[PDB]
Amino acid sequence: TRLVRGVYTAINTGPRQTLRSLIRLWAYEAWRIFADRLVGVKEKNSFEQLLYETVDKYLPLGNISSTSLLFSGLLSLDFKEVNKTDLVNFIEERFKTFCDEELEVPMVIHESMVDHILRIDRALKQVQGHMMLIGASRTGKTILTRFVAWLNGLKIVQPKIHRHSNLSDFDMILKKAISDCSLKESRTCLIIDESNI
Amino acid sequence: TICDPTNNKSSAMISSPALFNRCIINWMGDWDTKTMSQVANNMVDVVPMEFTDFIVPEVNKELVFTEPIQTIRDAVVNILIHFDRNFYQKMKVGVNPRSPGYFIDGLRALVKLVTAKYQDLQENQRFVNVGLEKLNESVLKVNEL
Amino acid sequence: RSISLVKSLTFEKERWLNTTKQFSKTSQELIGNCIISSIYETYFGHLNERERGDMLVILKRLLGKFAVKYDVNYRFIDYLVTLDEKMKWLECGLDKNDYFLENMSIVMNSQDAVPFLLDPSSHMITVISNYYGNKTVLLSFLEEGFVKRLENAVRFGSVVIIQDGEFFDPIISRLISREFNHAGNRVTVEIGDHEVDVSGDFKLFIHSCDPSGDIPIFLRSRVRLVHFVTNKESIETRIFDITLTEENAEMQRKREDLIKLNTEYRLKLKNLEKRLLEELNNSELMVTLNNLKKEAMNIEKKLSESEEFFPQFDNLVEEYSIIGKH
Amino acid sequence: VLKWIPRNLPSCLINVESSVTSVKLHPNLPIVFVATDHGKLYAFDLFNYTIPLASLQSHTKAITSMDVLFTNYTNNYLVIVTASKDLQIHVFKWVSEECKFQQIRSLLGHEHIVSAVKIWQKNNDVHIASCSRDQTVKIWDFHNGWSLKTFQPHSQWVRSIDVLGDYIISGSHDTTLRLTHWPSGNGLSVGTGHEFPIEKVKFIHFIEDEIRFRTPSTDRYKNWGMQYCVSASRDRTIKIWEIPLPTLAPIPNPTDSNFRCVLTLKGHLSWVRDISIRGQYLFSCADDKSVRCWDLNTGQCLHVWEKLHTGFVNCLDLDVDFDSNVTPRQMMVTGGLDCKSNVFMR
Amino acid sequence: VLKWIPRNLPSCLINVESSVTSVKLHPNLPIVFVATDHGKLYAFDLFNYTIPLASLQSHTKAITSMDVLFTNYTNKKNYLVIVTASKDLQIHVFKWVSEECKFQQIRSLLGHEHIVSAVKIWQKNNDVHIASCSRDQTVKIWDFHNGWSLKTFQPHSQWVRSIDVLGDYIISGSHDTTLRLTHWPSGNGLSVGTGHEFPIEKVKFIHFIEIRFRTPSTDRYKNWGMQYCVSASRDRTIKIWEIPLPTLAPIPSNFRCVLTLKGHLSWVRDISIRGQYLFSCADDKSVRCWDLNTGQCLHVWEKLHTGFVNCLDLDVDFDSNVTPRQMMVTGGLDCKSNVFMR
């Protein structure tokens, strides 16, 4: 069902499409629905060859790998396929502006982090969409979430949970965020870390 | 945001019914070798690195992680990524994800220290050469008189 | 006079010629030495001596595999610990052992990442307090008013050491992550709910006296953890020092004064050579350079006079070696 | 005479040391002043652009905005006022005898970076406006050198301002416009409808010639001298607003304290950075490496200057046509992030 | 436009720490690069000439020559590449970061057994290479991307002092009074020619401009594209030579001298061509402008430097990517450099 809804969003917010474009779009949606929970590189290769076999056998097309499929609506008014170097340059300039405006941190733009930004943007674009970033420390999870939230106009709220803090503080900050979300019509993006539980 | 998905709290977050059924799980994982090679190249290509001769070695295709070795930069990014992988292998971390923060910190320390050392070495050699030249000029002037 | 001045610089000319001969070697192998230095500075902080040596030999093999060269006689102290810094550290109160020198060098050379002093002996708090004089402040995670006092320390900008670091309080996460909001010529940091102003000379230190303690992964990944344990050489030289100062106190004091004078003379000779090279670079001068090498000859004569006391100490070391090893 | 449309290709290429932040045109001499993100302030010739006339480094930070003014009096030069992230507003003198630059005075007081600086002359008393991240719209005096007034009209920081007579508006980061009366220092009305910060906002001066959006509707708006204001945000859109008529020191009207978006232009692909007004045409640049040209009557794009630069198009500038002291030449200059500036001639 | 003559008085006077050996000009910016005898590079703003924008210790010995080129890639970003050659048996290649006005060392080329005297940079369709002459009597051709060697040959018994490059053809002049035109990949001597009795200082091609000395004569010369050459030696003369057409992989036959110019009083050092005019300096502190068409000296500049004069520089006029600015720059031995603008 999530795959169907993602295909609907991509079709509705997209330009005129061809059959190869439908295949690429459906494969990207399958990648973002089924293959994100995968952990192993062997499992990723198995999923890639499975997608090869499925498309070849049921739909009688370029490379379909994860880094070769970048669907985004950042570069235009529609959710279309984008190139690589132009997207990297645009996100470089946007990150330089973000470092100028909010906080300075020296991170280097590369392929996998661009793909992760695109999928985080896709997840946060959905209505009632929530994420569970799972990865090693200092990989760039919360700062990427902050950058994508700034790109989409989301307000950033981080709970100030620390030592000698109880459930009353958590309820207070949650109620404040809820009131800001509803009464003040301010789009907020709460970020809960593992250390904040 | 989950750092170690093996601990009890993170296992409770993952195995909770509605959190799993509502959130789009995006497994970042540890960085793979291509990502670390790319970021290492992109943050060491701005330093004076290749200033001596270099002979390309003979290594296996799967043993090298970057493009085939041409300059000092490919060699140093390969040696850094391979040593980081070996160091994580020696610490017996298991299936626990490996933080690449040590790699980034070491690479920043490397670029800063190589810049400082290259500047100091060039200044010292210029000083010793101008001193030797001044001594030779003084010797020539003394021999002329 | 000119002939005498030229003839008076024969040893320095030989040293300059040897340095120019060795420049090709020391430039061909610079990248490897820098690689090993960076690996020491970023990885081997939280390791023991045997594990450090094991990853040293595998890193030497791996570095030689990719046809990049290094120094065969490379040592971390000889590469990073400058002699003036060594003198300052020894005068502050840190021991003469080399492992502690390596760890003090890795601590006082990380200006980008805050260090984690894992010191069970609880004396590096006072040696770091001695390094910065009376301007330092001692904080802890178990004191009321810690937030306000840390904010005042940030506004003042003094060197701050936080003890009991295994009970980490996550309100300083913006200071651990070193993310700064640059507001013109002032730098602000949001701590808690109200921001503060960084004085620019603010330095943070976290010290924990609990081996095998518990620290958050967020704290662990961004803080250079360094261990501090007593190895065989430290206890051996400490036992030797105790037994020598309990056997012959005046003789021990004379030996300590002798070695301090020797290393001070070596530092003065190095500074003297640097000053002479700098003075000759920018070119009265002849009489000045005469005074320079007269001071050099006096220092050499003083060292040669000081040479005639060391075999006695070697004999005492050979005598007390059994006590040290037991 | 007024409906001139620039060609499909730029007339000439100007190379700058770093990213171009602002460009302005001398109202009399055909020369162009180009800002520089490195901090320099160039001054090029529209006919001999191979070598610059003069350029000096006056800031340690990036120059943010600038504008020119050919001074006139009731009793006679050109003045350039420069913004910078260095917390200073450096005012310069352009001497035409030796075609050089001479720094005059610096205006201090802001506690952070400034964003836009505007200058205007009225009854031989020229004033310099300013706006910073302190969300304080401080207005100085050029002749005296000291401050005149200071007020905070927004919760978050302002980004651009515009003046017309005694009224000043200011777009801000919190996506709200606000009209504040300068002599009285109080707000009149607010604007709402954006969910991205305002990049550039400017007034719509009336013209006597027919254009739908540059003519008064009622006699009250003709007496006020202003009816329309245009704001460009990061919503990839252009909005023409309606300012409600205040009850007149002017008194705010609680029943009419809100704006009204009469028209909402759309068609860009990224943030609109800078906007301009010329005749019945709306000239706007954006981060799509392109410049559009909207029509005020219909709201349709009539030309697409695709791939004008290889990067973001940070700024463009025209000549003011409402003012009788400035001849509205058919010259439009643009500046980009790709260290290039394109000048359009004829 | 292309017929500009520098004024009698210089427009900018720049001071440095030691003698100036190589002066180059930014093809796109009003920035001048100068090299000193201490192996130091100074990057100077034109309108702010007192304080150096950039100052770097490039080499431990004296720099001899320097060349610049703006890269052009059709894919990737462009940047300015500067090359420095010195007496350290090394060649250094830097990228000029114009974002913050600071040099950045890209790489180095090693392999020459003695000092290197001249290094050139030219761009192919999508690749860049570099040539070098040394005391080893060896012309060596390296590439900027990989860094390892592509060509090496010994064309002359004496040591080559100046190389010029166009396309796949190399003209080199040595301490011996002869020149040589060779082919780039094959490394064979297509043509030689003598006519001097003193060592050559600078030799370079004469390109085609869309004129007596810029026009192809026959259709058999237009397709090849190379017709003329210019050379200068310590003979106080500047010689315009004609090239023999090789039998086309080329197969090699002697040089023809079609013009000579005289009037210098000491050793000349540099040759530069702008449109119809020729700019040359000679060690009597004399900067002379000669006309190629008429064939005589037009204007002189004397006592520009108290000491000797080392080099000039003007922008390339025969390249599309380089704007022929109305400006000129020169250096001297007395820690002085002159900039003529407009």
Ligand SMILES: Nc1ncnc2c1ncn2[C@@H]1O[C@H](COP(=O)(O)OP(=O)(O)O)[C@@H](O)[C@H]1O
């Ligand atoms: N692509 C990258 N290049 C360089 N550094 C990075 C990159 N991604 C993350 N980092 C480092 O990680 C830090 C941010 O990680 P963060 O998202 O805060 O980790 P966590 O999610 O565990 O809180 C930064 O200080 C940065 O130095």
